[model samples]
Target: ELGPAEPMVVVPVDVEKEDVRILKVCFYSNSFNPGKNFKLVKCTVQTEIREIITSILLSGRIGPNIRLAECYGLRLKHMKSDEIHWLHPQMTVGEVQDKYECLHVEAEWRYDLQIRYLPEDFMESLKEDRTTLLYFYQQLRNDYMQRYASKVSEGMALQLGCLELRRFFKDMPHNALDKKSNFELLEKEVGLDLFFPKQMQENLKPKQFRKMIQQTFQQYASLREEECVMKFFNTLAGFANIDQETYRCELIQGWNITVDLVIGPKGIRQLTSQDAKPTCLAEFKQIRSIRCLPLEEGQAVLQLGIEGAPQALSIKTSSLAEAENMADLIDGYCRLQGEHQGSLIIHP
Candidate 1:
């Protein structure tokens, strides 16, 4: 049987003995500096998560060259325990450890950035442009892959796979032997998973899909890496929802109506059930500020400050938590623009 509460030790603190320990932090493989090992960060329980992030930035341990300040946030992960905790920057390491009680904590970077939304000046400096561009390219590739798994057409999927082959696998084949070796290399190195989506792979057997993708890949032999990359970007640009993030929100028309808040490059588009047509709520450029203020009955309204409109335009949220997230999302999109309205003005 489980025992009762353990007794506290009688010993008192003499200037508080140092409890400095090593924290292991890692980055995503897609990042510029996705180092092999868990980066050793020295800190005490009292050390704030913000300070640890600061240490990570200045440590020169991981992402030495990456302009990480704007793009990354830390998440507390427990592999064996089976849940994640969103650690607040202002919170202390000890606070989390104390709260969780069983924290085998390993901090990892969560990249939720849109490079296209970043200011021109922010991207133009140093080697940031090249890296950020490539970063966004990888993220875009990932997005397309996810869509293709469920929504995208089979014909278009093959086109994307072939384009990907051109971008990554550079050399043109010499003979049948060379081509055969390349095919083997593609399977071993990249795997067919990268080339085809789940549904496509399931519908069309591996051999057939491989052959189909290979045939298309051969056609792109003449196109170089840079050419293929550009083409891939342009091709995916055709899809209207390519760069969009959707949120299902209950419209405040007496709570019966619901709508989709589709946030994208151009603006926030609100779509209703009846028409299903996208109506622009506010463009990122026109947005001056965002705030989430409380209303009656445990709900809050996500408010926006528009340039040529009324003082504050608001959208109702089920709770303050949801409203806060929506507010943050709007603010993030605003920062993406070259000349955004201004800083976010959050009201209490």
Candidate 2:
């Protein structure tokens, strides 16, 4: 069944300009859980990043009390690239998209990035704003739970868990007052993960751990949520690496053992497991330069040009991104120290 051949018609594809582009962004705040805070906004390339963020804040999804000044920074990460591009407040949406090649750019709103450069009247300002204090408290809680929970002693863990429980749950009546029923009820109400890290929990018998948390939880029945939150925040602020950027790294030529490299206002710390106190490997004042050398398999080598050391300290990072991030932190700290030398304050 052959038909007559038709003449082929070719037409040029139409290219339309988009005045109002749809921007997909992920917002983060202490008020909401981390997993689900993405949304789409109608904007143009001329719109500033600050304007977009301000609009989101005014939308009331994050919270009613948070202010734009409290935000640390904004970053745009693309799906195709491993580099993270920090968005300046004045940077336009078009500029970011064009510069980063982000047709569908990935972005995040950082509420409090913990730069550790506290003002002299910081506590006074924090006291004036309840929401800001709570925001800081939540960040520290998360950092502690993720990194330093296993490092706390049993007694301290119990106190911290008590403070944690007090802030979250009121001293309400249990299903039953008996140990067995109480333990079961509390476990269901607040999982063990909330109170302590899994590594710390595994060190003790389940019954004993639960009982310790329960007893401590009972002791903090009279404290208000704000009080408990402040206490918990202060407790964690007293721990190491609370205000530092932490990365897991290994030596380039030394033992294969890995350690946590924490860089903050004071300097750099090398932390090995099972050690009570870590050593300050280098100070920001002593670091002359930082360089990152990419390696195979996403790993990279970090070289520090120290002032007094004979040779550069070479350490292996888990990934190229981490090595660069560490270098950035060190450079930033050094620069900050130069600009605001005496104004800096490191947390306990």
Candidate topping lDDT: 2
Backbone clash pairs for candidate 2 read none
Which lDDT value does model 2 have at 256?
Answer: 63
Question: TM-score for all predictions?
Answer: 0.62, 0.55
Cα lDDT of model 2 by residue, 200-244, tens digit = 677888777766776766677678878888677677667653556
* Full-model lDDT for every candidate: 0.61, 0.63
Candidate 1: segments with Cα more than 4 A from true spot = 1-128, 171-178, 198-207, 250-258, 269-280, 283-289, 294-299, 306-311, 335-343
Clash totals, every prediction? 1, 0
